[PDB]
Design a protein around this ligand. Sequence first.
Ligand SMILES: *[C@@H]1O[C@H](CO)[C@@H](O[C@@H]2O[C@H](CO)[C@@H](O[C@@H]3O[C@H](CO[C@H]4O[C@H](CO)[C@@H](O)[C@H](O)[C@@H]4O)[C@@H](O)[C@H](O[C@H]4O[C@H](CO)[C@@H](O)[C@H](O)[C@@H]4O)[C@@H]3O)[C@H](O)[C@H]2NC(C)=O)[C@H](O)[C@H]1NC(C)=O
Ligand SMILES: *[C@@H]1O[C@H](CO)[C@@H](O[C@@H]2O[C@H](CO)[C@@H](O[C@@H]3O[C@H](CO[C@H]4O[C@H](CO)[C@@H](O)[C@H](O)[C@@H]4O)[C@@H](O)[C@H](O[C@H]4O[C@H](CO)[C@@H](O)[C@H](O)[C@@H]4O)[C@@H]3O)[C@H](O)[C@H]2NC(C)=O)[C@H](O)[C@H]1NC(C)=O
Ligand SMILES: *[C@@H]1O[C@H](CO)[C@@H](O[C@@H]2O[C@H](CO)[C@@H](O[C@@H]3O[C@H](CO[C@H]4O[C@H](CO)[C@@H](O)[C@H](O)[C@@H]4O)[C@@H](O)[C@H](O[C@H]4O[C@H](CO)[C@@H](O)[C@H](O)[C@@H]4O)[C@@H]3O)[C@H](O)[C@H]2NC(C)=O)[C@H](O)[C@H]1NC(C)=O
Ligand SMILES: *[C@@H]1O[C@H](CO)[C@@H](O[C@@H]2O[C@H](CO)[C@@H](O[C@@H]3O[C@H](CO[C@H]4O[C@H](CO)[C@@H](O)[C@H](O)[C@@H]4O)[C@@H](O)[C@H](O[C@H]4O[C@H](CO)[C@@H](O)[C@H](O)[C@@H]4O)[C@@H]3O)[C@H](O)[C@H]2NC(C)=O)[C@H](O)[C@H]1NC(C)=O
Ligand SMILES: CCCCCCCC/C=C/CCCCCCCC(=O)O[C@@H](COC(=O)CCCCCCCCCCCCCCC)COP(=O)([O-])OCC[N+](C)(C)C
Ligand SMILES: *[C@@H]1O[C@H](CO)[C@@H](O[C@@H]2O[C@H](CO)[C@@H](O[C@@H]3O[C@H](CO)[C@@H](O)[C@H](O[C@H]4O[C@H](CO)[C@@H](O)[C@H](O)[C@@H]4O)[C@@H]3O)[C@H](O)[C@H]2NC(C)=O)[C@H](O)[C@H]1NC(C)=O
Ligand SMILES: CC(C)CCC[C@@H](C)[C@H]1CC[C@H]2[C@@H]3CC=C4C[C@@H](O)CC[C@]4(C)[C@H]3CC[C@]12C
Ligand SMILES: CC(C)CCC[C@@H](C)[C@H]1CC[C@H]2[C@@H]3CC=C4C[C@@H](O)CC[C@]4(C)[C@H]3CC[C@]12C
Ligand SMILES: CC(C)CCC[C@@H](C)[C@H]1CC[C@H]2[C@@H]3CC=C4C[C@@H](O)CC[C@]4(C)[C@H]3CC[C@]12C
Ligand SMILES: CC(C)CCC[C@@H](C)[C@H]1CC[C@H]2[C@@H]3CC=C4C[C@@H](O)CC[C@]4(C)[C@H]3CC[C@]12C
Ligand SMILES: CC(C)CCC[C@@H](C)[C@H]1CC[C@H]2[C@@H]3CC=C4C[C@@H](O)CC[C@]4(C)[C@H]3CC[C@]12C
Ligand SMILES: CC(C)CCC[C@@H](C)[C@H]1CC[C@H]2[C@@H]3CC=C4C[C@@H](O)CC[C@]4(C)[C@H]3CC[C@]12C
Lengths: 157, 283, 215, 268, 50, 51, 155
Amino acid sequence: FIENGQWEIIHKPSRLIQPPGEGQRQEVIFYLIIRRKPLFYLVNVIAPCILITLLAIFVFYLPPDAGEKMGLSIFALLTLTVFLLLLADKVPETSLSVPIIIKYLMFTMVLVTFSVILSVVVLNLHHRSPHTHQMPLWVRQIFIHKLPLYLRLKRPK
Amino acid sequence: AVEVTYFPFDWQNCSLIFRSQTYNAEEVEFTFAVDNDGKTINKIDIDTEAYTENGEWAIDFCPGVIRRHHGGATDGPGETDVIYSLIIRRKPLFYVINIIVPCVLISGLVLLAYFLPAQAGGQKCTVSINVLLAQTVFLFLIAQKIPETSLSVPLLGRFLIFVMVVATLIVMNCVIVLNVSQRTPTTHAMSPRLRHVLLELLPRLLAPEVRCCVDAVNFVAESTRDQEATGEEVSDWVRMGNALDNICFWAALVLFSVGSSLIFLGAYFNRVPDLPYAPCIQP
Amino acid sequence: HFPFDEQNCSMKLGTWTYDGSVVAINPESDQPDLSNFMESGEWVIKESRGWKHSVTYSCCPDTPYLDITYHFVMQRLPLYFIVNVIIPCLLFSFLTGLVFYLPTDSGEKMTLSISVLLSLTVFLLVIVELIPSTSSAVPLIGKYMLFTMVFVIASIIITVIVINTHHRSPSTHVMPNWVRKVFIDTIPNIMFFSTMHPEVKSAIEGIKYIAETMK
Amino acid sequence: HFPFDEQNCSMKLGTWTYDGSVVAINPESDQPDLSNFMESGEWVIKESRGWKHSVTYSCCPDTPYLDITYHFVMQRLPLYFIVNVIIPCLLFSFLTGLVFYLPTDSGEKMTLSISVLLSLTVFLLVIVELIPSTSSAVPLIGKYMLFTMVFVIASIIITVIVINTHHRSPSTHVMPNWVRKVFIDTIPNIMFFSTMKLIKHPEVKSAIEGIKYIAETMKSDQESNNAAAEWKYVAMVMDHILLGVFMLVCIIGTLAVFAGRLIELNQQ
Amino acid sequence: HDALKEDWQFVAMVVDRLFLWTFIIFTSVGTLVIFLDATYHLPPPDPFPS
Amino acid sequence: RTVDRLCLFVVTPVMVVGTAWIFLQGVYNQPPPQPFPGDPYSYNVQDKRFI
Amino acid sequence: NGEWEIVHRPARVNVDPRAPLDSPSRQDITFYLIIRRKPLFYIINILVPCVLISFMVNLVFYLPADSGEKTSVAISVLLAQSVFLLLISKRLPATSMAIPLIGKFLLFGMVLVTMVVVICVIVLNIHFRTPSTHVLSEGVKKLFLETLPELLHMS
Ligand SMILES: *[C@@H]1O[C@H](CO)[C@@H](O[C@@H]2O[C@H](CO)[C@@H](O[C@@H]3O[C@H](CO[C@H]4O[C@H](CO)[C@@H](O)[C@H](O)[C@@H]4O)[C@@H](O)[C@H](O[C@H]4O[C@H](CO)[C@@H](O)[C@H](O)[C@@H]4O)[C@@H]3O)[C@H](O)[C@H]2NC(C)=O)[C@H](O)[C@H]1NC(C)=O
Ligand SMILES: *[C@@H]1O[C@H](CO)[C@@H](O[C@@H]2O[C@H](CO)[C@@H](O[C@@H]3O[C@H](CO[C@H]4O[C@H](CO)[C@@H](O)[C@H](O)[C@@H]4O)[C@@H](O)[C@H](O[C@H]4O[C@H](CO)[C@@H](O)[C@H](O)[C@@H]4O)[C@@H]3O)[C@H](O)[C@H]2NC(C)=O)[C@H](O)[C@H]1NC(C)=O
Ligand SMILES: *[C@@H]1O[C@H](CO)[C@@H](O[C@@H]2O[C@H](CO)[C@@H](O[C@@H]3O[C@H](CO[C@H]4O[C@H](CO)[C@@H](O)[C@H](O)[C@@H]4O)[C@@H](O)[C@H](O[C@H]4O[C@H](CO)[C@@H](O)[C@H](O)[C@@H]4O)[C@@H]3O)[C@H](O)[C@H]2NC(C)=O)[C@H](O)[C@H]1NC(C)=O
Ligand SMILES: *[C@@H]1O[C@H](CO)[C@@H](O[C@@H]2O[C@H](CO)[C@@H](O[C@@H]3O[C@H](CO[C@H]4O[C@H](CO)[C@@H](O)[C@H](O)[C@@H]4O)[C@@H](O)[C@H](O[C@H]4O[C@H](CO)[C@@H](O)[C@H](O)[C@@H]4O)[C@@H]3O)[C@H](O)[C@H]2NC(C)=O)[C@H](O)[C@H]1NC(C)=O
Ligand SMILES: CCCCCCCC/C=C/CCCCCCCC(=O)O[C@@H](COC(=O)CCCCCCCCCCCCCCC)COP(=O)([O-])OCC[N+](C)(C)C
Ligand SMILES: *[C@@H]1O[C@H](CO)[C@@H](O[C@@H]2O[C@H](CO)[C@@H](O[C@@H]3O[C@H](CO)[C@@H](O)[C@H](O[C@H]4O[C@H](CO)[C@@H](O)[C@H](O)[C@@H]4O)[C@@H]3O)[C@H](O)[C@H]2NC(C)=O)[C@H](O)[C@H]1NC(C)=O
Ligand SMILES: CC(C)CCC[C@@H](C)[C@H]1CC[C@H]2[C@@H]3CC=C4C[C@@H](O)CC[C@]4(C)[C@H]3CC[C@]12C
Ligand SMILES: CC(C)CCC[C@@H](C)[C@H]1CC[C@H]2[C@@H]3CC=C4C[C@@H](O)CC[C@]4(C)[C@H]3CC[C@]12C
Ligand SMILES: CC(C)CCC[C@@H](C)[C@H]1CC[C@H]2[C@@H]3CC=C4C[C@@H](O)CC[C@]4(C)[C@H]3CC[C@]12C
Ligand SMILES: CC(C)CCC[C@@H](C)[C@H]1CC[C@H]2[C@@H]3CC=C4C[C@@H](O)CC[C@]4(C)[C@H]3CC[C@]12C
Ligand SMILES: CC(C)CCC[C@@H](C)[C@H]1CC[C@H]2[C@@H]3CC=C4C[C@@H](O)CC[C@]4(C)[C@H]3CC[C@]12C
Ligand SMILES: CC(C)CCC[C@@H](C)[C@H]1CC[C@H]2[C@@H]3CC=C4C[C@@H](O)CC[C@]4(C)[C@H]3CC[C@]12C
């Protein structure tokens, strides 16, 4: 038997299907229940998505003064777009449901997009003009007095 | 055979040649059929009611001719055939919407580099070289569509190569402007010729303790004086870079506009010629 | 209206060489038989019907030509194109406007905008692989793609204008009165959260000089 | 020599089951009939000829085996590959050298070089889908692609070295004497010169010592800035030399790849 | 001015660390959910289940 | 900068050695000397097996 | 062939003792082709560019933190590796018998480049610390300013 490198045969029964009950006809149906072997997609899609996701997480450890948060986050988005192009050749084209790998890809893209957005928010806070923007008191009380203790951020002095 | 010169704003001349496989002209000859009124139907007939036009191609003309040849004594028995000439016109809407217009806008973006500052945070080269990268992506996209012949260069390819060349020239110019603007007195000398040409000629053409304390104060004052003179020469360098940017923006805009306009006007005068034939599909 | 398009596709069937006077064709039923129809993962047949037609031409008033045309009205299932095409374009469209919340002093405004444009440009390769390429009309998905691209281009242009305004030095450029009236006075009212011995003589002149320079 | 290649393609015809002793084949003409040949948009047939051949094996002396082989010498039309492949490669090769005229303080040298490399990497899709996948020999266009890629990589490496040189300071490194001699002294001698080479009150005493401390501090930072400027000058001299070298190597490689075949075609 | 700028920058740092932890949590939860959904999708024990 | 230098000397040898290992599995990959393992015969016209 | 060299080419008469004599599967003659790929095209067009681009990511350690172009270089190398993976994805079947050698190298290099991006993030985080943000302890100074530099022969 010439075994397929992408499919494993789990079950292979055969059945006689009688007509429901003059022109009626029986059938002999040979069933093949087959499981895909997904090593190719683990190597070529899933692991890159995990790595890109890790980089998207690590954007938030990059200091604002480095001026590199946008570069890393948005080029991670560009890499995810390249992997969407990779998957476009392989996935089924039907519309009765969404493949779980596509769901994971869009989850990762939403994560990277939110990383871009929140990095922009952080940079907006960092580069805020002291002379032009007056700090509200609630911002002080939450983000300088209350929240830093829970995040294990001890401001010197 | 696809005449590629004005692709995608192109029209083609596709031949349908019919002949007897077995018999020569002396054995079998061809005549055109006639309509109800007796008019000879020397063309491709199309039923207007049942005809659905191709999504990309419009049939503008379709004459037919009966040719006889090879009737010479040396040639021997005469041969004949019937040739129909489908003159078809491409509807370029897909290429306009999906390729040409985005490419034109992205290629126009490099002109914006002239308006960014010539400083570390200005990101002039960022814009220029990344537009070039996008143009390379468009080259990949267009490779899957153009014909693969070499009798002439298609218009789409010619325009793409032109905008790539323009972007390369603007990248070089932006590099030169950044080189001129960032010059420091400690590392580069103040050339008076270039300054006169750009900033002057072009706009018109267009008790030991007391002594030690006093020495310290004087040293601080002279350091401040040196800093002010260094910053004034740096300012002169930035003004020279600004003038270079100002002139070269207009130069690059003229180049881009003229080249794009000529390339597309070459297609604008590429209509189907006014042949002495009735339309293939009567309106 | 793609990917939300409806298509009416027909199958005209007739005796090629026999006219109605020698062979008559009649539909078995008014609708095509869909009892053994396999479900599609891309289309839903909303309607189906068979119609007999007879045509008599002037040149042959005694030989009517018959046909039976079966038409199927079908609606596309758009989930594939919604998930794979619309959602990325929407993400890029949302990220386009984020540049105007990114400060100029970051030095990354052009990085963000130009890289969003680059991501959209690669997704154009994706769209060309997924969407059908025809020139009979501009599909709705193509209108959205062109809108997103023009949106990004406009964001880039206006971002360059904002950067140029931010970096305007006072020595070279001078504030017009209309700019001050529009942006520093009228507009900030709508909104809020922002605001607006000889050597001893030499040393004396040096101290006063440092003060004047700082002024 | 792809895409400037010449191909000799043959078509051998013969009676499969009849040998020369029972069926003899003779050419109708010395050359194939090209009277009704449609024009090709990719190839030009320079020469065409039909030759008859007879082969006799030692084990079968009496049964000669005949064939007629029609050969066609074809020259590729290279305009398509020149426009779509060669010119973008030449543009990237030209852009490779422009990093060495960029100032280090611009903060865009790596951006330019890396973006040129990314453009080349995207261009790899085009070149591999257009170039044939065969290992008989390296195509000339493939040689040019490899040359260009290798030299963008070299430019990136040397640009990293130059940027590291520019940022050296006395707080991190000490200028070697040989670097000074080679770059600040010898090379400018063979270069066009365009670049420069109650007093007892404690508060009063504290103020005096403070102004002294300020004076010494700014003197120290002036000396540090001078050493840093020396490093920057060395990096600038290296950058000018590399600009010249990379432009010359770009031209030399572009000629050395193609000009031999181009002259061979021009001389025929 | 430096003190007020430093206060703004410290607020930015605190917000950045909060977003770091939030992204770690959301990433871990979503990735675990998707991966467990994929891993536990096993072939049928019987060819004709009830 | 000290961390950068340490990470250079740690990471570059790892990548070099791993790449060399991965590609050296491929460089010295050739088919076996005989077509069939366990069969010494070469199945070549040079080594004719006369009756 | 322009890609395959024939190494061995045996011919064998195969008889199945288990199958019955009246079965078509009893006897066959098999002609085998052991063929070795000629890797010159793949070498020149993928492996040398891919390997060199992956190796260049080590250059980020020699870039200064003040350059502001470290993580950009590293993530761009990752993007180029992704493009190479896209190129390779079209040329082989999606079999699970083994990871291809080029696939193994690409996975290894992408993991390494991701680690390098993380290291660059950490280095940039360390570089931009100030007294108002972080406390520089005496132990950290002892380890990273004196001991390690003379271990590492730093200037
Ligand atoms: C998708 O595309 C198809 C094809 O274009 C459309 O099909 C049309 O469907 C309509 C019905 O909705 C058809 O109209 C009907 O045709 C019947 C057959 O006509 C033939 O036979 C009679 C003799 O019996 C001849 O006189 C006639 O000339 C034809 O040869 C008629 O019997 C119907 O008549 C009924 O409606 C009219 C309305 O004016 C009444 O006056 C009558 O009394 C009677 O109630 C009717 O005319 C049409 O012919 C179909 N076209 C074709 C080519 O098949 C689909 O509708 C379309 N689907 C969409 C868009 O939803
Ligand atoms: C592209 O590739 C093709 C091959 O596929 C080349 O074709 C060869 O062309 C040369 C001529 O340029 C051929 O050589 C000529 O062969 C003739 C026939 O030879 C057969 O018949 C004789 C007589 O029975 C036998 O002896 C012989 O073995 C063959 O069976 C000869 O008649 C020609 O004679 C000429 O040369 C001799 C020796 O110099 C002189 O003495 C004669 O007077 C005369 O000048 C000649 O030998 C060759 O056979 C072709 N090969 C094939 C397989 O067709 C193309 O040339 C090549 N194109 C290019 C440009 O490279
Ligand atoms: C792979 O795909 C095949 C189909 O291509 C699946 O085979 C089907 O499997 C299901 C479940 O095993 C079968 O459904 C069951 O059929 C039984 C027999 O039905 C026939 O005989 C009765 C006689 O009275 C007729 O009335 C009927 O029309 C059929 O001709 C039923 O007895 C079963 O009833 C059970 O389910 C119903 C609900 O649907 C309950 O109301 C009942 O109480 C009872 O619990 C059931 O309907 C189906 O017939 C199979 N199709 C075939 C053989 O073509 C494989 O299961 C699938 N494999 C996997 C792993 O997914
Ligand atoms: C390329 O691919 C081909 C297949 O397409 C390979 O050919 C196979 O090669 C292997 C090894 O040479 C063969 O396996 C061997 O078959 C021998 C004969 O088996 C037949 O004859 C016996 C007679 O008693 C029958 O019982 C049996 O059913 C068969 O009809 C065995 O004797 C060999 O056993 C030896 O090795 C095993 C371990 O593998 C030991 O346990 C035994 O004790 C003994 O030492 C062995 O099984 C196989 O039959 C070939 N397949 C064919 C011809 O179709 C090529 O080898 C491969 N080339 C490469 C990879 O280079
Ligand atoms: C390849 C990937 C890994 C690369 C690792 C490279 C390592 C490079 C090595 C450098 C270590 C740092 C040396 C200098 C600073 C030490 C002193 C200091 O301020 O410590 C700080 C904490 O420590 C850190 O901030 C450590 C750096 C961040 C680690 C992030 C998690 C691990 C890596 C990411 C996840 C990897 C796995 C997932 C992704 C693959 C602050 O300390 P403190 O709170 O003030 O406490 C006071 C006492 N003390 C000051 C004496 C400490
Ligand atoms: C679409 O394609 C068709 C078919 O190619 C084409 O019709 C052909 O056009 C050519 C001209 O381009 C015709 O050839 C001419 O025939 C007349 C006799 O009928 C000759 O007198 C002409 O001679 C002139 O051109 C010669 C060129 O070699 C000169 O040597 C000579 O001195 C004359 O100047 C010429 O040979 C050909 O007969 C027709 N074929 C038909 C109609 O069947 C048609 O024009 C194309 N339509 C377009 C492009 O709109
Ligand atoms: C580099 C810039 C200036 C131009 C970019 C467009 C290029 C591709 C254009 C400019 C001039 C063009 C050439 C002009 C004329 C001819 C002669 C014609 O019989 C075949 C095509 C050919 C040979 C063209 C090929 C394409 C071409 C080389
Ligand atoms: C793009 C800018 C910079 C340069 C434009 C140069 C113009 C004159 C060039 C560009 C492309 C050229 C055309 C390309 C190909 C052909 C087909 C050939 O059978 C006749 C000449 C013709 C029609 C060329 C005429 C000259 C042409 C229009
Ligand atoms: C580090 C910078 C300077 C880039 C250096 C690139 C070097 C290593 C490149 C340039 C050209 C390359 C060669 C080009 C072609 C071949 C032939 C074949 O057998 C594959 C390997 C081999 C022999 C390559 C080995 C690596 C090579 C020598
Ligand atoms: C081996 C078979 C039984 C499957 C077992 C499930 C394995 C593969 C799943 C279960 C939980 C998963 C982890 C859950 C969350 C994360 C964090 C994310 O940032 C990277 C991936 C990572 C680290 C996942 C890796 C794969 C994982 C370990
Ligand atoms: C370490 C990096 C550059 C990865 C690539 C390593 C490559 C270029 C090296 C590693 C070991 C080398 C092989 C080692 C020894 C031999 C035998 C000799 O006949 C030359 C070729 C050959 C077969 C070499 C080919 C090139 C090779 C495979
Ligand atoms: C850094 C330099 C060496 C470039 C990287 C080279 C990498 C890709 C290595 C990996 C495997 C290597 C090949 C493996 C085997 C051989 C041996 C011999 O047949 C010539 C060289 C050749 C064909 C090697 C060329 C270089 C090679 C392709």
